[PDB]
Design a protein around this nucleic acid. Structure first.
Ligand code: ZN
Ligand code: ZN
Length: 65
DNA sequence: CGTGCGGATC
DNA sequence: GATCCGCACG
């Protein structure tokens, strides 16, 4: 494996994370995090980006439609 | 205290 | 497209 597998699938990364190629804290519950008070993962944090899984929640699958 | 990059596999 | 992952510098 490797490495195969080696990657993918652990907690999902924020919009800016995927764009900067970085893993993160903001998990599948990042939204619920903001609900329980989140902030910014390590990425958006260093780059004061925009920790978000919303537009995402709609960009990925959502869909919508 | 930000800054980005190459990779693995579909 | 997505997720992981560090790192070396100023
Ligand atoms: Zn992130
Ligand atoms: Zn973030």
């Amino acid at each position: 494996g490797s490495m195969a597998d080696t990657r993918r699938r652990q907690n999902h990364s924020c919009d800016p994370c995927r764009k900067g190629k970085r893993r993160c804290d903001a998990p599948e519950n990042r939204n619920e995090a903001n609900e329980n008070g989140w902030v910014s993962c390590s990425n958006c944090k260093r780059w004061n980006k925009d920790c978000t899984f919303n537009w995402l929640s709609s960009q990925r699958s959502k869909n919508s439609s």
